[PDB]
């Protein structure tokens, strides 16, 4: 269904990232029907195509638009997420309130379980991957991997190579929360090894300014056994959503991207 598609096909405007498995450029496409829209192109020096799940269909997860293996190297045509992502915000800002945190993380919560439910595992879960439209909703990039990075995000069956399940995203999920809420990580050492080590102690301080419902949230995915950590079923991502961290949160008009953002990019 995109197969007459060509890298001609594109105007390369500027470079937008530089990812580990490959480079990513803001294009034009200049043929129609849609000559003029703006793309993200990430270019692959490798190889595959197929018809590592790329292609997602969800509010919350960024949108294949094409894909065509010219010479060599794969080009993906994603969308454009104007805002940029959520670390560069959460740097500017250095730490969010827990108003913004909620909706960030609820909209995320949608996007996680979607991947899980296609049997994906978002290993590379952080600020740095999740992206903003130009509305202020969130847009998961950077995804796919199944059969299966930044220390500090490790949950601690990874750090221990015991296992690596969808739980490993949960706990991920409880360090972006964690970061986003106090601007820090909840365990960092000096260096990989003892970043390594702090993980698996799990011993973390609490800091007062959160909220007691933050507080009981993050225990409960900051749990070391992956079978007790929230998310491990049997309701699934459901006993997450049902936390009362987000009790004001309509999760049906949520995923209708009825919610109005708090930052406006």
């Known amino acids: 269904g995109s197969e ?20 990513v450029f803001l294009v034009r496409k200049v043929t129609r029907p ?16 197929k018809v590592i799940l790329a292609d997602v269909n969800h509010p919350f997860v960024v949108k294949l638009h094409y894909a065509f293996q010219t010479e060599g190297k794969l080009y993906l045509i994603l969308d454009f997420l104007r805002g940029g ?5 959460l740097s500017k800002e250095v730490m969010f309130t827990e108003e913004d945190v909620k909706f960030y993380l609820a909209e995320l919560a949608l996007g996680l379980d ?11 879960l952080k600020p740095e991957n999740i992206l ?28 221990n190579r015991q296992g690596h399940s969808h739980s490993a995203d949960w706990w ?45 949230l993050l225990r409960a995915l900051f749990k ?17 959503k049902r936390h009362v961290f987000y009790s004001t949160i309509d999760w049906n008009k949520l995923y209708r991207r009825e919610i109005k953002p708090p930052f406006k990019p």
């Open 114 to 124: 979607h991947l899980h439910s296609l049997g994906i595992i978002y290993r590379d």
């Open 224 to 240: 070391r056994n992956p079978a007790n950590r929230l998310g491990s079923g049997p309701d699934g991502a459901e006993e997450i």
């Open 85 to 89: 992502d959520l670390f560069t915000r």
């Open 132 to 159: 903003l439209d130009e509305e202020g909703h969130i847009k998961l990039t950077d995804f796919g991997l199944s059969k299966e990075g930044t220390v500090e995000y490790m949950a601690p069956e990874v750090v």
């Open 34 to 49: 849609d000559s003029g829209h703006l793309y993200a192109m990430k270019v692959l020096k490798k190889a595959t195509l």
């Open 172 to 216: 991920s999920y409880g360090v972006l929360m964690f970061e986003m809420l106090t601007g820090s990580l909840p365990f960092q050492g000096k260096d990989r090894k003892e970043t390594m080590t702090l993980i698996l102690k799990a011993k973390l301080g609490m800091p007062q300014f959160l909220s007691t419902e933050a507080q009981s």
């Open 4 to 23: 007459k598609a060509d890298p001609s096909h594109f105007e390369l405007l500027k470079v937008l990232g530089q990812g580990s498995f490959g480079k």
